[PDB]
Short mmCIF file of all heavy atoms in Angstrom, two decimals:
data_model
loop_
_atom_site.label_atom_id
_atom_site.label_comp_id
_atom_site.label_asym_id
_atom_site.label_seq_id
_atom_site.Cartn_x
_atom_site.Cartn_y
_atom_site.Cartn_z
N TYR A 1 0.80 -1.23 0.00
CA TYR A 1 0.00 0.00 0.00
C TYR A 1 0.82 1.28 0.00
O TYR A 1 0.33 2.34 -0.40
CB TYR A 1 -1.03 -0.03 1.12
CG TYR A 1 -1.96 -1.20 0.97
CD1 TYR A 1 -1.83 -2.31 1.79
CD2 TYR A 1 -3.00 -1.18 0.06
CE1 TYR A 1 -2.70 -3.37 1.69
CE2 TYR A 1 -3.89 -2.23 -0.04
CZ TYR A 1 -3.61 -3.40 0.60
OH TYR A 1 -4.61 -4.36 0.71
N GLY A 2 2.06 1.18 0.42
CA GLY A 2 2.93 2.34 0.38
C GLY A 2 3.08 3.03 1.72
O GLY A 2 2.80 4.22 1.85
N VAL A 3 3.51 2.28 2.73
CA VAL A 3 3.77 2.87 4.05
C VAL A 3 5.16 2.47 4.53
O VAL A 3 5.86 1.71 3.83
CB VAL A 3 2.69 2.52 5.15
CG1 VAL A 3 1.32 2.92 4.69
CG2 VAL A 3 2.68 1.06 5.51
N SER A 4 5.59 2.99 5.65
CA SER A 4 6.90 2.65 6.20
C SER A 4 6.84 2.54 7.73
O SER A 4 6.63 3.53 8.44
CB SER A 4 7.93 3.70 5.77
OG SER A 4 7.95 3.81 4.35
N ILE A 5 7.00 1.34 8.22
CA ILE A 5 7.00 1.05 9.64
C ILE A 5 8.33 0.38 10.01
O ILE A 5 8.56 -0.80 9.71
CB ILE A 5 5.77 0.15 10.04
CG1 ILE A 5 4.46 0.90 9.71
CG2 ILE A 5 5.82 -0.22 11.54
CD1 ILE A 5 3.19 0.13 9.98
N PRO A 6 9.26 1.17 10.62
CA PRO A 6 10.61 0.71 11.01
C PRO A 6 10.61 -0.52 11.92
O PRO A 6 9.65 -0.74 12.65
CB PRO A 6 11.19 1.92 11.75
CG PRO A 6 10.44 3.08 11.21
CD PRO A 6 9.05 2.59 10.96
N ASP A 7 11.71 -1.28 11.89
CA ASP A 7 11.89 -2.54 12.65
C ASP A 7 11.56 -2.33 14.13
O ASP A 7 10.76 -3.06 14.72
CB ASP A 7 13.34 -3.09 12.53
CG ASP A 7 13.80 -3.37 11.10
OD1 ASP A 7 14.30 -2.45 10.40
OD2 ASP A 7 13.65 -4.53 10.62
N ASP A 8 12.15 -1.28 14.71
CA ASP A 8 11.93 -0.91 16.12
C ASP A 8 10.48 -0.60 16.42
O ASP A 8 10.01 -0.88 17.49
CB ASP A 8 12.81 0.30 16.53
CG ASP A 8 12.42 0.92 17.88
OD1 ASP A 8 12.77 0.34 18.94
OD2 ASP A 8 11.76 1.99 17.91
N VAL A 9 9.78 -0.07 15.45
CA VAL A 9 8.38 0.32 15.63
C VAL A 9 7.47 -0.89 15.39
O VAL A 9 6.52 -1.12 16.14
CB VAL A 9 8.00 1.48 14.66
CG1 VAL A 9 6.57 1.93 14.89
CG2 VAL A 9 8.95 2.65 14.83
N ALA A 10 7.76 -1.64 14.34
CA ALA A 10 6.98 -2.82 13.98
C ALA A 10 7.06 -3.86 15.08
O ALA A 10 6.05 -4.37 15.52
CB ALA A 10 7.45 -3.40 12.67
N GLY A 11 8.24 -4.12 15.58
CA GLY A 11 8.38 -5.08 16.66
C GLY A 11 8.15 -4.44 18.01
O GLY A 11 8.80 -4.79 19.01
N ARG A 12 7.23 -3.50 18.04
CA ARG A 12 6.90 -2.73 19.23
C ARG A 12 5.38 -2.52 19.28
O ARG A 12 4.84 -1.93 20.24
CB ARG A 12 7.64 -1.41 19.12
CG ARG A 12 7.55 -0.43 20.26
CD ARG A 12 8.43 0.77 19.92
NE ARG A 12 8.36 1.84 20.92
CZ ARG A 12 9.04 2.99 20.84
NH1 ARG A 12 9.95 3.20 19.87
NH2 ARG A 12 8.85 3.92 21.77
N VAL A 13 4.68 -2.98 18.26
CA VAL A 13 3.23 -2.90 18.24
C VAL A 13 2.66 -4.16 18.86
O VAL A 13 2.48 -5.16 18.21
CB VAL A 13 2.64 -2.61 16.80
CG1 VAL A 13 3.00 -1.21 16.40
CG2 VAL A 13 3.13 -3.58 15.73
N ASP A 14 2.49 -4.11 20.16
CA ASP A 14 2.06 -5.25 20.97
C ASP A 14 0.62 -5.65 20.66
O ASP A 14 0.23 -6.82 20.80
CB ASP A 14 2.22 -4.90 22.45
CG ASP A 14 1.95 -6.06 23.39
OD1 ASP A 14 2.69 -7.04 23.36
OD2 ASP A 14 0.95 -6.02 24.13
N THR A 15 -0.17 -4.69 20.23
CA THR A 15 -1.54 -4.95 19.86
C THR A 15 -1.76 -4.63 18.37
O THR A 15 -1.19 -3.66 17.84
CB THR A 15 -2.53 -4.15 20.75
OG1 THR A 15 -2.29 -2.74 20.61
CG2 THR A 15 -2.36 -4.53 22.20
N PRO A 16 -2.57 -5.44 17.65
CA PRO A 16 -2.84 -5.27 16.21
C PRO A 16 -3.46 -3.92 15.88
O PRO A 16 -3.30 -3.40 14.76
CB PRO A 16 -3.81 -6.40 15.88
CG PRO A 16 -3.56 -7.41 16.94
CD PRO A 16 -3.27 -6.62 18.18
N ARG A 17 -4.15 -3.32 16.85
CA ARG A 17 -4.77 -2.02 16.63
C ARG A 17 -3.69 -0.95 16.43
O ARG A 17 -3.91 0.02 15.75
CB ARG A 17 -5.73 -1.62 17.77
CG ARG A 17 -5.08 -1.49 19.13
CD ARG A 17 -6.06 -0.97 20.18
NE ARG A 17 -7.19 -1.88 20.44
CZ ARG A 17 -7.38 -2.53 21.60
NH1 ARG A 17 -6.41 -2.57 22.50
NH2 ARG A 17 -8.53 -3.15 21.85
N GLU A 18 -2.51 -1.19 16.99
CA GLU A 18 -1.39 -0.27 16.85
C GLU A 18 -0.81 -0.35 15.45
O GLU A 18 -0.42 0.65 14.88
CB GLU A 18 -0.31 -0.59 17.86
CG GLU A 18 -0.71 -0.37 19.29
CD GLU A 18 0.34 -0.86 20.23
OE1 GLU A 18 1.32 -0.12 20.48
OE2 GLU A 18 0.24 -1.99 20.71
N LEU A 19 -0.80 -1.56 14.89
CA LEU A 19 -0.27 -1.79 13.55
C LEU A 19 -1.17 -1.03 12.55
O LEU A 19 -0.69 -0.30 11.67
CB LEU A 19 -0.28 -3.31 13.24
CG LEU A 19 0.74 -3.86 12.20
CD1 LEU A 19 0.60 -5.36 12.08
CD2 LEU A 19 0.58 -3.21 10.83
N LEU A 20 -2.48 -1.17 12.74
CA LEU A 20 -3.44 -0.48 11.89
C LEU A 20 -3.42 1.02 12.17
O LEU A 20 -3.64 1.80 11.28
CB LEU A 20 -4.85 -1.07 12.06
CG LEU A 20 -5.96 -0.43 11.20
CD1 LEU A 20 -5.61 -0.47 9.71
CD2 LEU A 20 -7.29 -1.14 11.45
N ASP A 21 -3.10 1.39 13.40
CA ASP A 21 -2.99 2.81 13.80
C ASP A 21 -1.86 3.47 13.04
O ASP A 21 -2.01 4.59 12.51
CB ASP A 21 -2.73 2.94 15.30
CG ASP A 21 -2.48 4.37 15.74
OD1 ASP A 21 -3.45 5.11 16.00
OD2 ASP A 21 -1.31 4.78 15.82
N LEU A 22 -0.74 2.77 12.99
CA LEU A 22 0.42 3.21 12.26
C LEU A 22 0.09 3.36 10.79
O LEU A 22 0.30 4.41 10.20
CB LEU A 22 1.56 2.22 12.41
CG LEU A 22 2.15 2.05 13.81
CD1 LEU A 22 3.22 0.99 13.78
CD2 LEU A 22 2.73 3.37 14.30
N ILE A 23 -0.48 2.32 10.21
CA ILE A 23 -0.85 2.34 8.81
C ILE A 23 -1.95 3.37 8.53
O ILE A 23 -1.98 3.98 7.48
CB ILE A 23 -1.20 0.92 8.26
CG1 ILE A 23 0.08 0.06 8.24
CG2 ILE A 23 -1.83 0.98 6.88
CD1 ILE A 23 -0.07 -1.28 7.57
N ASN A 24 -2.82 3.58 9.50
CA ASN A 24 -3.84 4.63 9.40
C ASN A 24 -3.19 5.98 9.25
O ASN A 24 -3.49 6.70 8.31
CB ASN A 24 -4.77 4.67 10.63
CG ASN A 24 -6.09 3.94 10.44
OD1 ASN A 24 -7.10 4.34 11.02
ND2 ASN A 24 -6.10 2.87 9.68
N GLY A 25 -2.25 6.26 10.12
CA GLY A 25 -1.58 7.54 10.11
C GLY A 25 -0.70 7.71 8.89
O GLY A 25 -0.44 8.82 8.44
N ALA A 26 -0.24 6.61 8.36
CA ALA A 26 0.62 6.61 7.22
C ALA A 26 -0.18 6.76 5.92
O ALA A 26 0.11 7.64 5.11
CB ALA A 26 1.45 5.35 7.21
#
């Protein structure tokens, strides 16, 4: 889809809502 979630950030999203939150903001 065209987003960027760094290793430190990706392996820091303890809940799936955070992953979608990141992608939402992106």
Side-chain angles (χ1 to χ4, degrees):
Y1 301 104
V3 304
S4 304
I5 299 177
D7 302 86
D8 168 77
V9 183
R12 184 178 176 180
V13 291
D14 186 65
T15 60
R17 62 175 64 113
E18 294 174 82
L19 206 178
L20 180 56
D21 174 85
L22 294 178
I23 292 187
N24 263 212

